[PDB]
């Protein structure tokens, strides 16, 4: 029920709630999906990488 994620690409809020943009492993960008932060606890390493990147600039 969980899929391997390759990269977190973006962050946003929809109706007040935080979401991240997910690039899935073994899938091209056309399959990328905005997921609620609640969904993404098992890839918090990648989330962290993404948040480091935007902080870097």
């Amino acid at each position: 029920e969980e899929y391997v994620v390759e990269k977190i690409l973006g962050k946003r809020f929809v109706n007040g709630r935080p979401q991240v943009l997910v690039k899935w492993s073994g899938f091209p960008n056309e399959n990328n999906t905005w997921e609620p932060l609640e969904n993404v606890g098992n890839c918090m390493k990648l989330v962290s990488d993404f948040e480091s990147e935007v902080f870097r600039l």
Binding site: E1, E2, Y3, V4, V5, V40, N42, C43, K45
Partner: peptide, 8 residues
């Protein structure tokens, strides 16, 4: 750790 997430 394997990096995974749910789809929704």
């Amino acid at each position: 750790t394997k990096q995974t997430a749910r789809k929704s």
